[PDB]
C-alpha cells in the first residue's frame, strides 16, 4: 500500500488552484477525492463580516444622503467580502471616505494582520462632493454558515449574516499516474476555487487532519 503525497500545486489563478495527490491505490482515488471535497465544502475555517456600525444609520432599511445604495445593499456587499486575518480571531475594521467616487475595499485602513485579498471590490458609490461615511466593520472567524437570526445590542449595530467558508467550488479528478513499471495507481487532481483567503495546501492539510481526527474514534 503506497501512500499519497502532495507532489504539485498549480496556482493557475489568483483564487482557484489545482493541487495534485499521487500515488493512490486503485479505488482509493475516488474515496479520498469525495471525502476531501465534502470536508472542504463543509468544514473549512474562514473570516467574514459579522456586524457593521454605520454612523448615521439606525436600521438596515434606511438610506444615507450621499450614497447610491440603500444600507441593505451595502450590508450585502460587506457580506460579500474577503479577508485573511492571521493572529486575531475578532478584529474591528473601519472605513472613512469622502467625495465623489466608488468606495472600494482598499479604503479600509487595515491593520497589520488584516489582508484584504481583493482591494477593488466595490462596496458603495458616493455621489456628493462633501458626504462622508464611517462604518465600523467587524470581522471574526468561524466555520460553516451562521445566520443572524440564530447567533446567541445597541440600535446602531447592523447584524450581517456570515458565511465562514473560503471555498466556493471543489472539483476532483482521478486518472492514471506516471509510475515507472506499474498500473492501477491513481493520480488525484483536486481543482479548488476559493476566494483567496486560504492557501490550497493549508486547506488540503486541514481537511486531512479533520478526517483523521474523526477516524480517531476507532
Amino acid at each position: 500500500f503506497l501512500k499519497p503525497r502532495l507532489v504539485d500545486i498549480e496556482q493557475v489563478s489568483s483564487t482557484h488552484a489545482k493541487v495534485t495527490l499521487e500515488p493512490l491505490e486503485r479505488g482509493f482515488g475516488h474515496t479520498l477525492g469525495n471525502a476531501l471535497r465534502r470536508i472542504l465544502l463543509s468544514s473549512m475555517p474562514g473570516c467574514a463580516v459579522t456586524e457593521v456600525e454605520i454612523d448615521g444609520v439606525l436600521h438596515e432599511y434606511s438610506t444615507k444622503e450621499g450614497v447610491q445604495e440603500d444600507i441593505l445593499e451595502i450590508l450585502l456587499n460587506l457580506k460579500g467580502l474577503a479577508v485573511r486575518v492571521q493572529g486575531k480571531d475578532e478584529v474591528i475594521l473601519t472605513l472613512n471616505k469622502s467625495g465623489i467616487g466608488p468606495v472600494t475595499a482598499a479604503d479600509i485602513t487595515h491593520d497589520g494582520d488584516v489582508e484584504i485579498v481583493k482591494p477593488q471590490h466595490v462596496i458603495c458609490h458616493l455621489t456628493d462632493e462633501n458626504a462622508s461615511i464611517s462604518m465600523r466593520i467587524k470581522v471574526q472567524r468561524g466555520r460553516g454558515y451562521v445566520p443572524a437570526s440564530t447567533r446567541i445590542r445597541p440600535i446602531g449595530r447592523l447584524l450581517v449574516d456570515a458565511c465562514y467558508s473560503p471555498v466556493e467550488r471543489i472539483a476532483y479528478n482521478v486518472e492514471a499516474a506516471r509510475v515507472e513499471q506499474r498500473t492501477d495507481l491513481d493520480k488525484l487532481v483536486i481543482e479548488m476555487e476559493t476566494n483567496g483567503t486560504i492557501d490550497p495546501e493549508e486547506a488540503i492539510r486541514r481537511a486531512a487532519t479533520i478526517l483523521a481526527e474523526q477516524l480517531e474514534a476507532f
Binding site: H30, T31, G33, N34, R37
Partner: protein
C-alpha cells in the same frame, strides 16, 4: 435553434449532462437534465400558516 445555441457554447446538444452524486461521489448511471429554470416564490409562506 435551442440546440444550435447550446452548441455555440460547449454544452451537449441533447441538453442533458452527466451528474455525480454529492454524497457517495459516484456517477448517476444516466445522463440527467441540468439547466437554469426561473423559479418564483409565492407568498404562501409556512410561517403565515402554522
Amino acid at each position: 435553434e435551442i440546440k444550435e445555441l447550446l452548441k455555440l457554447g460547449d454544452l451537449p446538444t441533447s441538453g442533458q449532462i452527466r451528474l455525480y452524486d454529492g454524497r457517495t461521489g459516484e456517477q448517476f448511471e444516466r445522463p440527467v437534465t441540468v439547466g437554469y429554470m426561473y423559479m418564483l416564490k409565492l407568498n404562501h409562506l409556512v410561517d403565515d400558516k402554522m
